Nucleic acid binder design. Sequence first.
RNA 1: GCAUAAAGAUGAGACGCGUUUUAGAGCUAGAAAUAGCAAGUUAAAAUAAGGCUAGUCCGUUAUCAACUUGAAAAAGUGGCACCGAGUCGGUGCUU
DNA 2: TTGTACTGTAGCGTCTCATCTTTA
DNA 3: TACAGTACAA
Length: 1168
Amino acid sequence: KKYSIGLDIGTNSVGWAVITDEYKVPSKKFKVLGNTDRHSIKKNLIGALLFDSGETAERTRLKRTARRRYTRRKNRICYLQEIFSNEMAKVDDSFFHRLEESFLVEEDKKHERHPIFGNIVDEVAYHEKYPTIYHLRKKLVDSTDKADLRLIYLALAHMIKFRGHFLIEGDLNPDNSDVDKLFIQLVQTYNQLFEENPINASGVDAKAILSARLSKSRRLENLIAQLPGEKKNGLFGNLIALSLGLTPNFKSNFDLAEDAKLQLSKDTYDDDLDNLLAQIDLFLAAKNLSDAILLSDILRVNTEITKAPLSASMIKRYDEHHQDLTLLKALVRQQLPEKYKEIFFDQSKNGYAGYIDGGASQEEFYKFIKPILEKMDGTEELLVKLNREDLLRKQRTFDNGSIPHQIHLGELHAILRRQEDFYPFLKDNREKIEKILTFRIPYYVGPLARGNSRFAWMTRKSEETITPWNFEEVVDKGASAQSFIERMTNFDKNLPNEKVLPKHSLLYEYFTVYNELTKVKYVTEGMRKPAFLSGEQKKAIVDLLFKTNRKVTVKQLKEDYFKKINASLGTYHDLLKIIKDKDFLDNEENEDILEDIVLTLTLFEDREMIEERLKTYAHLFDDKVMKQLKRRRYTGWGRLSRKLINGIRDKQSGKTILDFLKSDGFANRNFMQLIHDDSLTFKEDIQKAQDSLHEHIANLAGSPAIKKGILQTVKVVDELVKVMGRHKPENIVIEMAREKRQLVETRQITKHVAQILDSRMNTKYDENDKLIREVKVITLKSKLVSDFRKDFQFYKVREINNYHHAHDAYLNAVVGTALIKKYPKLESEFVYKATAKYFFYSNIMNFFKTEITLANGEIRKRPLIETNGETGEIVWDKGRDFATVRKVLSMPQVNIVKKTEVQTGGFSKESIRPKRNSDKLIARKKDWDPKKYGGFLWPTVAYSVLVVAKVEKGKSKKLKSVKELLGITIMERSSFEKNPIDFLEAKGYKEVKKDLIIKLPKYSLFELENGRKRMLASAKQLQKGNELALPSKYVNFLYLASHYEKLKGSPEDNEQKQLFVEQHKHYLDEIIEQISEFSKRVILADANLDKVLSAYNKHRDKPIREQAENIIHLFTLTRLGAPRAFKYFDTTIDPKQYRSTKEVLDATLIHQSITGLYETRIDLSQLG
RNA sequence: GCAUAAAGAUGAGACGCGUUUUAGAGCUAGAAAUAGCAAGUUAAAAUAAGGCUAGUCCGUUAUCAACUUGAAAAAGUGGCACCGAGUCGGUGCUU
DNA sequence: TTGTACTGTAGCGTCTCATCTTTA
DNA sequence: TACAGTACAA
C-alpha cells in the first residue's frame, strides 16, 4: 500500500518514478478528458519531464544597459540642441529638423534633401572642403575665423555623441605632452633639485619603452645609457616608477623629501604626494611622462604643433589612405589588369570594394590582399604598412576604444575658446557644454527613476528634472551611495532584521580571534588534566600579542605568564599606526563611533563622501589625521549583526556572547556551541527571530536557472501525491551530484530539494515534538547508482532515448530504500577523514553482490536474502529483485513529457536586412515602411493559434471556409491577447469562431496514424515526438561494444565481455531492423533511411567497435526533438525537415499534465 | 566560524565597432542590353515595435497542460486488484 | 499558381565598481 | 534550429 518516489533532477530534465516496497512500478487506468472516444488509458508510474534550460538574466541586463546608454546619449544631443536653438533660429532655422529627417527617403522628407546646408552646391562644396568630420574639427580648433554656426554644431555634437572612455581620471592635457622626448626636461628638474649638473647627452625616451612590455629589464640599462650613472634606481632619468608606480607598494627610491610607498595609481597622486603638496618638482615631469607613454601609444607622431592632435592623426590616416589607394590602383592596373575588377568593383570578395562597400573587416581585407600585394613587385612599403596593420585604414575602426574623453574635451574646449568672441552665447554657457560632455551618472547612484523602477535606489533632495548641471543639488549622493551598498550586503542568517557589520569591525575581529582562541587548550606540566584558556589568559594573549602584532602563538603562557603571574586583529594595528593612541582603541566608551568610522570607510570609496561622513567628528580630531583616515579604506562585510554581538545577555551566566568569548573561565564554550544550546537562552530567541514557495525559491540564492529544476521537481511531487490518492510517500530519494555551469547549477538544483520537499511534505506535529517525521527525504550521491548500473549489467546509453532519466530515477529509488532498510541506524547520515569516508562509501555497496571480493583476489559469499538483522525483515532478495529491475528497465511505455512553453525573448533576429520588395520584413519603426527602409527577419513565435474562419481567396472574392494554424509572434502577442477577433480580422480572416481558438505553445503534442507523434515547433515547423524503446539486450550489447577496450575492467572479466560482444554480432542486424521499422513507422524519412541502409551494408566488414560507434551515432535519426545532421562511417546524412503543419490540423491534440498521467485528447478533425 | 581554492550569480555606470536609410551632383561612347574610366575613408538618424505612472523611467530573466469556479491571487476536478507488454493491452470487483 | 526540397542565415569586442553564493 | 531564400514541381 505504501510507496516511495524516486527523483533525478537535472538542468534539462526531471526524472520521476514511483515504486512500491518490493521495487515494482505500479500502473493505473487514468481518465481521459476531451471529445475523443477513448475514455481510459493504462499508464505506468515512471517517467521524465523535459524542458528547455533556464537562462540567466545576464543578456537582459546587457541589453537594458544598452537601452539606457542610447536614451542618455540622445538626451545629451537634445541638451546641446536646446542650447543652440535660439541662435540657430536666426540662421537656417530648419537645420535641426533636417538632421532629424536625415534617415527618411527623398519623398518622405518635408525639407530639402541635403541636411547640413540645404542645397546641392554648398553641400558638395562642404564635402570637398572637409572630406571627413575630423578635417572640420581640426579647422575649428586651429583656425581663427568666424565659422558658420552649423559647422560648430556638427563638430560639438560629434564630440559629445562619441566621447571616449573615462578610465583615466586625472585632468590630463595632451598639448603639454605632445612630444615624444622629455628626457632633458626631467633631467633639468632633477639636477635643480639634486645639485650635480653632470655632463649629459639627449635622447628620445617615450617610445623606447613602448617597444616592449614596460619593465625594468629594458629601463635600467636604457636609463643608464641615457644619463651617465651615479645611481641605478633613483637617477630620475626616465625610471619606470616615475612613469607608472609599482603594482606592489614599495618605498621611495632616492626619495625627494619623505619616505612613502609608491604604487600604480590614477586616483591618489594628487593626494599621497603630501611630502611636497602639503608642504611646498620631479613628479610634474613624471606625470608628463606618464601621459606621454600612452598618448604616444594612441596618437601618431605630430611634427606640427596643433591643439587638436586626434583630428590631425585622423587626417594623417585619411591622407595615407588616399595615397596608398592611388598607388595600389596604378599597380594593379599595370601588373594584374584582370584582378582590378574583382578587387575594386566586386563588393562581395573581401577586396577593396568589399572592404569599403561590402562587409569585410580590416583583417579580412588584409588577408585577401596580402597574396595579391606580395605576388607583385614595387609593393614593399605597402607590405610593411600591412604588417604594421596601417594600410588603407579608416577613421572609425574597432580600436578607437583607447581614446580618453580628455582629448575630445580638449578639442571641444579649444573650439569654444576660439569661437566664443563671435557668438556671445557660446561664451555664456561654455561650462554647460563641457559639463554635457564630461558628465557621468555615478555607478553608486544608478537609474534616475521617480519610483517606477525596480532597479533604482536613488533618493533625491528635490523633485526637479535632473540635468547634468543640477545633479549635485538634486540627488542626495550620500544616501544613494549608502543604499548602493545596503541593498547588496545581506542580513545575518540568524536574526534577519539587522544589517551585518563590516568584516574589519573591531567587534567582529574580536569575535573571530576570541572564538578560535576559546577552544585553545594547553597541556603542560602545571596540570595533570587539559584546561582551556581562561579569560585572564585570553586577555593576556590578546593584549600582549594581538594588540601589537597580527600573527599569533600561544606559547607565551608557558614561557612567560605561568612564571610571571587564521586569526587577526588587523584593524586595531592599522588604527594604532594611524591614531597611534592605544587608549582610544582600548576605550570601549566610544567603540560605537569607532565602528562608525570603520563603517563609513567600508561603505564609501569616493573620497569626498568619506569626508562628508567625517564632518560630524571634526571636533574629535585635528586636520592632518583625517587626511590620514581618508587614505584608509576597508573592504568586506561580517557574517553576523551587532545585536547578536552585544545586544543580548544570557539569563543564566549573565554574560553577553562576546563576554563568553572574552571570558568563559575553564570549560570554554565557542560561539556555535553557545547559540546551539537552549539551557543558555540563545536558541529559543533565534527560533523566535524567524511565506511562499516562489520566494523561498529565490532568497535561497542563485541564478534563475535553479527555479526550473527545483520548481518542476516540486510540482511533479505534488501531482504524484495527487495521483496516489493523496497518500504521502514514506521516502523521497534525491540525486545530489556530489563527490561546468551544468554541474554547479545542478548541485544548486539539488541542494534546495531536501529542504523544500521536507518542509512541504512534513507539516503536521504535536505538543511533544514539533515535527512528526513521516516522509524521509533521502539524499544519494551519483556514484552509488553509477556503480549499481556498472556492476549488474544495467548500462545506460544516453544516445538511444530519453528513458534513461526515468530509469535513473527508478534506480535512485530502489538503491535508496534498499540501502536504508539494510542499515536503519544510519538514517541520520542520509535522511534529511575524506579517505575514510571514501572507503566507507566504497565498501557499503557490496551487500548487493552475491560474491564479494576484497583487495586480496579471494572470495567470500553472502546469502541471497538480505535482512535488516535488527529485525528479520527481508530488505533485498538476489534473484527476484534483479528480475524486477530488469523487467522495469525493459518496459516500453514511459511517460516522457516535453514541457510546453510560450516562447519569450527577442522580437526577432538582431541584424537589419537591406530593403526589398518583400512582405516578410519587419518594420523598424511605425512610419518606416520596410520596402523603403529595410528591417528585421526571423521573428520568434510566442505561441501558435488554431483558427477556423472564412478567408477571401480567389480573384472572384467569395468565402471559402478554412482551418489553419497561425503564428502569433512576440510583437503581436499583446495586441492579440488584447482582442483576438479584431487582430484575426485584420489578418484577413472573416467570421472567426471565437470559442474554437486553441492556444498552442511550442512543443504542443499531436498524435497521428500508427501512434506517430509530432511536437509543434512553430506554426510552420514540427518535431519528432516518439521514443524508440529499444530492448535492454541491445542497449547492453551497444554499451559493451562501443566502449570496447576503454572499459578498463579486471582482465578475465573484460576478456569474457570481449568474447560476449564478439559472439553476439547479429545484434547489429537486429538493431538495424529495429531502427528501420521504427523509422518507417514514425520518422517517415525514406531517402535518409535507405542511405543509412546502404552505408551500413557497405561497411559490414568493419570491426565491431567502429560499427557499434556509428550505430550509436545512428540514433540521431530516431531521436525525439529537432531533426539533426549525423554521420555514419563516411557519409554525413542531412536531416529530413518536417516543414509543414498541414498534417496536424486533423490529428489528436494531446494535453499532457506535468507528469503526463492526466491527459485531455482533442480530436481536431471534428472542428469547423 | 576562519584561512586556502575554484567556479558561478545579481545589479549599476561607461566606451568602441557593426547594421540600416539618406546626404557626399559620377563622366564618356551610345535605342541599349551596356562597355570603358573616375570615385570610395565621412556624417545624420534608429538600434528591440513601443508603453504611460511622462522618469535623463520601463520594455528579451523567472512564471505558464486542459477544464470548473475566481477581476486576479488562488482554490477545485480524474476508483481498485490481477495476468500480461512495441509506447500500454486484456480480465475481474466497485458506483 | 503554389506546395516540397535544398542550401543558407543567424551583433559583438572590452572596461570600471559593487556585493554575494556552493562546493573542495 | 527555425526560418529564409532560390528554384523546382503542381
